[PDB]
Each structure stands twice: as C-alpha cells, then as structure tokens.
Short mmCIF file of C-alpha atoms in Angstrom, two decimals:
data_model
loop_
_atom_site.label_atom_id
_atom_site.label_comp_id
_atom_site.label_asym_id
_atom_site.label_seq_id
_atom_site.Cartn_x
_atom_site.Cartn_y
_atom_site.Cartn_z
CA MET A 1 3.13 -0.65 -38.36
CA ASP A 2 1.78 2.79 -37.45
CA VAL A 3 -2.00 2.73 -37.99
CA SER A 4 -3.10 5.78 -35.96
CA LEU A 5 -3.19 9.36 -37.50
CA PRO A 6 -0.16 11.52 -36.49
CA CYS A 7 -0.69 12.74 -32.92
CA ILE A 8 -1.11 16.52 -32.76
CA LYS A 9 -1.64 17.99 -29.22
CA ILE A 10 -3.31 21.43 -29.13
CA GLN A 11 -3.47 23.77 -26.08
CA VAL A 12 -4.99 27.16 -25.86
CA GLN A 13 -4.90 30.04 -23.36
CA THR A 14 -7.28 32.97 -23.65
CA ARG A 15 -7.51 36.43 -22.10
CA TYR A 16 -10.19 39.12 -22.35
CA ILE A 17 -8.71 42.39 -23.66
CA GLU A 18 -10.51 45.06 -21.64
CA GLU A 19 -8.55 47.82 -23.55
CA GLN A 20 -10.07 46.74 -26.88
CA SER A 21 -13.61 46.11 -25.66
CA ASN A 22 -16.67 48.25 -25.10
CA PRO A 23 -19.29 46.35 -22.91
CA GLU A 24 -21.68 49.19 -23.35
CA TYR A 25 -21.75 48.68 -27.08
CA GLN A 26 -21.68 44.85 -26.73
CA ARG A 27 -18.21 44.44 -27.95
CA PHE A 28 -16.09 41.94 -26.02
CA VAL A 29 -12.57 41.28 -27.35
CA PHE A 30 -10.51 38.18 -26.59
CA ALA A 31 -6.93 37.21 -27.36
CA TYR A 32 -5.95 33.51 -27.79
CA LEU A 33 -2.58 31.84 -27.68
CA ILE A 34 -2.34 28.38 -29.25
CA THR A 35 0.42 25.77 -29.12
CA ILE A 36 0.51 22.88 -31.62
CA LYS A 37 2.88 20.05 -30.54
CA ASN A 38 3.76 17.39 -33.04
CA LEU A 39 3.85 14.16 -31.10
CA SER A 40 4.30 11.88 -34.11
CA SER A 41 7.49 10.57 -35.73
CA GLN A 42 7.27 12.66 -38.83
CA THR A 43 7.29 16.24 -39.73
CA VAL A 44 3.78 17.66 -40.39
CA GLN A 45 2.42 20.92 -41.82
CA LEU A 46 -0.57 23.00 -40.96
CA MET A 47 -2.23 23.94 -44.24
CA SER A 48 -5.44 25.49 -43.30
CA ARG A 49 -7.98 26.25 -40.55
CA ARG A 50 -11.69 26.43 -39.90
CA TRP A 51 -13.29 27.97 -36.87
CA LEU A 52 -16.80 27.84 -35.58
CA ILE A 53 -17.28 30.70 -33.09
CA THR A 54 -20.44 30.79 -30.99
CA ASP A 55 -21.43 33.60 -28.72
CA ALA A 56 -23.33 33.20 -25.47
CA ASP A 57 -26.61 33.67 -27.15
CA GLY A 58 -25.82 31.07 -29.66
CA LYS A 59 -24.94 33.14 -32.68
CA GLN A 60 -22.53 31.24 -34.98
CA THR A 61 -19.96 32.60 -37.38
CA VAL A 62 -17.38 30.71 -39.55
CA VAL A 63 -13.89 31.86 -40.18
CA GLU A 64 -11.55 29.85 -42.45
CA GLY A 65 -8.46 30.28 -44.55
CA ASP A 66 -4.98 28.92 -45.29
CA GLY A 67 -2.34 28.96 -42.63
CA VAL A 68 -2.41 30.48 -39.26
CA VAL A 69 -1.44 34.16 -39.03
CA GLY A 70 -0.40 34.05 -42.67
CA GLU A 71 1.81 30.99 -42.52
CA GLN A 72 1.69 27.24 -42.94
CA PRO A 73 4.01 26.07 -40.17
CA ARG A 74 6.03 22.92 -40.75
CA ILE A 75 6.45 21.18 -37.49
CA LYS A 76 9.24 18.54 -36.86
CA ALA A 77 8.62 15.51 -34.61
CA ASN A 78 8.56 16.50 -30.93
CA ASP A 79 8.53 20.20 -31.88
CA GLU A 80 5.83 22.76 -31.40
CA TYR A 81 4.46 25.89 -32.99
CA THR A 82 2.84 28.69 -31.07
CA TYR A 83 0.86 31.72 -32.24
CA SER A 84 -1.78 34.13 -31.11
CA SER A 85 -4.87 35.72 -32.61
CA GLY A 86 -8.16 37.08 -31.38
CA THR A 87 -11.86 37.31 -31.78
CA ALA A 88 -14.53 39.79 -30.81
CA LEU A 89 -18.01 38.69 -29.58
CA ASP A 90 -21.23 40.50 -28.88
CA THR A 91 -21.34 38.75 -25.50
CA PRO A 92 -18.88 38.44 -22.47
CA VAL A 93 -18.52 34.67 -22.97
CA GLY A 94 -18.59 32.39 -26.03
CA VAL A 95 -17.02 29.23 -27.48
CA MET A 96 -14.61 28.46 -30.32
CA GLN A 97 -14.09 25.00 -31.86
CA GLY A 98 -12.88 23.89 -35.28
CA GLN A 99 -10.30 22.05 -37.23
CA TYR A 100 -6.81 22.23 -38.74
CA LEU A 101 -6.21 20.51 -42.03
CA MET A 102 -2.69 19.24 -41.97
CA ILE A 103 -0.51 17.10 -44.24
CA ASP A 104 1.94 14.33 -43.21
CA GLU A 105 5.40 13.72 -44.52
CA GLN A 106 4.17 12.00 -47.69
CA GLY A 107 1.84 15.02 -48.40
CA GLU A 108 -1.19 13.12 -47.13
CA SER A 109 -4.13 15.14 -45.81
CA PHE A 110 -5.42 14.70 -42.19
CA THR A 111 -7.91 16.66 -40.13
CA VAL A 112 -7.24 17.60 -36.53
CA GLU A 113 -10.17 18.52 -34.31
CA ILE A 114 -9.93 21.54 -32.05
CA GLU A 115 -12.27 20.78 -29.22
CA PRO A 116 -14.66 23.53 -28.02
CA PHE A 117 -13.18 25.98 -25.50
CA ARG A 118 -14.60 28.96 -23.68
CA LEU A 119 -13.90 32.61 -24.17
CA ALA A 120 -14.76 34.58 -20.98
CA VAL A 121 -14.44 37.73 -19.21
CA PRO A 122 -12.66 37.28 -15.87
CA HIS A 123 -14.81 35.50 -13.24
CA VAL A 124 -12.65 34.36 -10.27
CA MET B 1 -6.42 24.03 -21.80
CA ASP B 2 -5.69 20.77 -23.66
CA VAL B 3 -8.18 21.04 -26.61
CA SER B 4 -7.39 17.95 -28.66
CA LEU B 5 -8.54 14.44 -27.80
CA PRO B 6 -6.05 12.27 -25.90
CA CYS B 7 -3.36 11.03 -28.18
CA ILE B 8 -3.56 7.19 -28.49
CA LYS B 9 -0.82 5.61 -30.82
CA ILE B 10 -1.90 2.20 -32.44
CA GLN B 11 0.71 -0.09 -34.03
CA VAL B 12 0.33 -3.48 -35.54
CA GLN B 13 2.26 -6.42 -36.98
CA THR B 14 0.41 -9.17 -38.86
CA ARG B 15 1.61 -12.68 -39.82
CA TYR B 16 0.09 -15.28 -42.14
CA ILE B 17 -0.62 -18.58 -40.32
CA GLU B 18 0.31 -21.26 -42.72
CA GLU B 19 -0.75 -24.02 -40.30
CA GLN B 20 -4.26 -22.72 -40.01
CA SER B 21 -4.74 -22.10 -43.78
CA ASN B 22 -5.75 -24.06 -46.80
CA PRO B 23 -5.04 -22.18 -50.01
CA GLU B 24 -6.54 -25.08 -51.96
CA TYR B 25 -9.82 -24.49 -50.18
CA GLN B 26 -9.35 -20.65 -50.39
CA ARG B 27 -8.82 -20.26 -46.78
CA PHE B 28 -6.08 -17.84 -45.61
CA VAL B 29 -5.51 -17.13 -41.86
CA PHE B 30 -3.57 -14.26 -40.38
CA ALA B 31 -2.78 -13.29 -36.87
CA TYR B 32 -2.39 -9.65 -35.75
CA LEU B 33 -0.51 -8.14 -32.82
CA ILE B 34 -1.74 -4.63 -31.74
CA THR B 35 0.00 -2.24 -29.33
CA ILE B 36 -2.01 0.71 -27.98
CA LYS B 37 0.14 3.43 -26.40
CA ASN B 38 -1.26 6.27 -24.21
CA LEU B 39 0.56 9.44 -25.22
CA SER B 40 -1.73 11.76 -23.35
CA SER B 41 -1.39 12.93 -19.75
CA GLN B 42 -4.48 11.08 -18.52
CA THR B 43 -5.60 7.56 -17.95
CA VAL B 44 -7.84 6.21 -20.64
CA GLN B 45 -9.77 3.00 -21.06
CA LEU B 46 -10.56 0.94 -24.08
CA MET B 47 -14.20 -0.09 -23.99
CA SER B 48 -15.09 -1.54 -27.29
CA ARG B 49 -13.97 -2.14 -30.89
CA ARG B 50 -15.36 -2.21 -34.37
CA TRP B 51 -13.65 -3.72 -37.35
CA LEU B 52 -14.33 -3.58 -41.09
CA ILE B 53 -12.46 -6.43 -42.84
CA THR B 54 -12.00 -6.32 -46.59
CA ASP B 55 -10.80 -9.24 -48.60
CA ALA B 56 -8.82 -8.83 -51.85
CA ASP B 57 -12.08 -9.11 -53.85
CA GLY B 58 -13.87 -6.45 -51.90
CA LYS B 59 -16.02 -8.67 -49.67
CA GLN B 60 -16.64 -6.88 -46.38
CA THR B 61 -17.38 -8.14 -42.92
CA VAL B 62 -17.99 -6.27 -39.62
CA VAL B 63 -16.79 -7.60 -36.29
CA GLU B 64 -17.57 -5.72 -33.07
CA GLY B 65 -17.96 -6.18 -29.38
CA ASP B 66 -16.79 -4.81 -26.07
CA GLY B 67 -13.20 -5.11 -24.94
CA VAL B 68 -10.43 -6.68 -26.87
CA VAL B 69 -9.74 -10.34 -26.07
CA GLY B 70 -12.27 -10.17 -23.25
CA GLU B 71 -10.83 -7.06 -21.55
CA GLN B 72 -11.37 -3.40 -21.26
CA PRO B 73 -7.78 -2.28 -20.61
CA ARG B 74 -7.21 0.79 -18.47
CA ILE B 75 -4.11 2.46 -19.85
CA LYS B 76 -2.12 5.06 -17.96
CA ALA B 77 -0.10 7.87 -19.51
CA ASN B 78 2.99 6.54 -21.32
CA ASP B 79 1.99 2.93 -20.67
CA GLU B 80 0.89 0.61 -23.35
CA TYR B 81 -1.41 -2.42 -23.90
CA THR B 82 -0.59 -5.29 -26.43
CA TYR B 83 -2.95 -8.16 -27.54
CA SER B 84 -3.16 -10.45 -30.56
CA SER B 85 -6.02 -11.90 -32.34
CA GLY B 86 -6.62 -13.37 -35.81
CA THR B 87 -8.78 -13.21 -38.91
CA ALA B 88 -9.33 -15.65 -41.77
CA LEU B 89 -10.08 -14.54 -45.43
CA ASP B 90 -11.08 -16.09 -48.67
CA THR B 91 -8.13 -14.46 -50.44
CA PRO B 92 -4.18 -14.32 -49.69
CA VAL B 93 -4.42 -10.59 -49.04
CA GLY B 94 -6.86 -8.15 -47.54
CA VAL B 95 -7.37 -5.10 -45.37
CA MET B 96 -8.56 -4.29 -41.80
CA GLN B 97 -9.53 -0.86 -40.42
CA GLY B 98 -11.86 0.19 -37.67
CA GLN B 99 -12.33 2.02 -34.50
CA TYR B 100 -11.82 1.79 -30.78
CA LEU B 101 -14.28 3.57 -28.53
CA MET B 102 -12.43 4.74 -25.45
CA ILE B 103 -13.21 6.78 -22.36
CA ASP B 104 -11.03 9.54 -20.84
CA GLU B 105 -10.35 10.15 -17.14
CA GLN B 106 -13.61 12.06 -16.67
CA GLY B 107 -15.39 9.17 -18.28
CA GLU B 108 -16.04 10.92 -21.55
CA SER B 109 -16.25 8.95 -24.77
CA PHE B 110 -13.89 9.38 -27.71
CA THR B 111 -13.39 7.34 -30.86
CA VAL B 112 -9.72 6.37 -31.94
CA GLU B 113 -9.56 5.47 -35.72
CA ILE B 114 -7.54 2.39 -36.65
CA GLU B 115 -6.35 3.19 -40.19
CA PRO B 116 -6.32 0.48 -42.90
CA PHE B 117 -3.57 -2.08 -42.79
CA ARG B 118 -2.98 -5.02 -45.01
CA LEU B 119 -2.96 -8.62 -44.28
CA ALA B 120 -0.80 -10.61 -46.68
CA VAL B 121 0.75 -13.85 -47.38
CA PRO B 122 4.55 -13.39 -47.34
CA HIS B 123 5.74 -11.63 -50.57
CA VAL B 124 9.36 -10.44 -50.15
#
C-alpha cells in the first residue's frame, strides 16, 4: 500500500550573530533554527546527522554524530521537532547540506536529505 | 527555507488477473493501481518512470519511458493522480520497485523512489 519513504519536511532559518563574530579575524558566526515535520502516518525517530559545511572559498568540513543537540527526537505523525545550533565560517557566506538518518516505526533505517542552504551576513 | 525535496506519497494496490494468465504455461498477469499524492506546497509534474521487475526466481527486467500511461501529470499541492497498468511474470509472485523523475515548480528535477512491492497470486 504505502511504497514511498516516510515524508519528512525540513525548514531552516539562519541568522548571522554579529556579537559572536570577528570579521577582522575572519570569523563569521551563524545560528540556525531547524524544524522537522513528520508528514507520514507513523512515528519516526532521528538517530543521527551528517553535515557538509562549505565556506565561500570552497573549504569543506564534515560534522557528524548521533542525535541533534544531544537527543534523538521521536516524532509522532503530523508533529514536528524544532532545535537550533550554529556554525562558524572563515567567510561571510557559506553553505550547509547533509543528511539525517532516521528510523521508521518498525525500526527500519531511512536517510533524509537536507538540501543545500546558504549562510550569509545580512545583505538587504 | 524549505530544504527537503517536495513530499510525494506513492500508494499501490495490485491484483492478479486470472483471465489473462496461464499457470500451465507459466504465465502470471497482474494489474497495478498507483496513486501519487502531492504533499508539498508546490505544483509538481511527473515526467518519466523507471521500473525494475523481479520475478520469484530473480529474473530482472527494466521498463522505462516518459509519462505514465501516455501522460505527464501535473499535480497540484494536496491533489493526487491515479493510473493503472499491468505486468506479466513467469512466476505466481514477484516484486516491482523503481523511480519517478519529477520536476518542481521552478522546473528542477528530483527523483521519487518507488519502494519494492510484491505482486502475488491470491494467498489468504
């Protein structure tokens, strides 16, 4: 009957933290706030994460581990989980992309892609 | 920022077609009815498909082409598209899995995985 992977919708908002940064010393600090909405009919659980973080010059770093912010959130159908974290770059703009490794209700592994998004100093 | 690919829910029901089959001659025919639901907030379009069909003895076949049933359905948010089609195997059971290639509202490509489902003679 269901033959699609559980639908997980991810949104992100970002903000440059001027109070933690030092442009002079090439240190640009960003905060990110991420919402994970379970759009499937089962409860799912975020087990681990892997980030690929690229600065504006193209320098790549990998950051992985279990959970987000120290936890493995269990998300019911039609529920969501939000958290925030941060990264520092050597440049005023950069990109993060990666994946969450989740499990479904039967303890089955599935990977969820976090599409690339930009980190940027204000530019309106 | 939405940073996951559009959520597309695929469901399926299959049926063995006794009138089209000939067990004596090892010919087993199944029909399949697929519903594709747009759970994102943009209009998407299904452009092509690719199937891997596996019979109960492991014999594999690939079937691919543009559209489904001649069409490239344009599917709005919270609408759905249903079609049926059919496959014949040498064996009373087998498996189908594959992919749809869709485009999003900006006309970007994304692949939707159709997980394995079984085709089977009735066995209740």
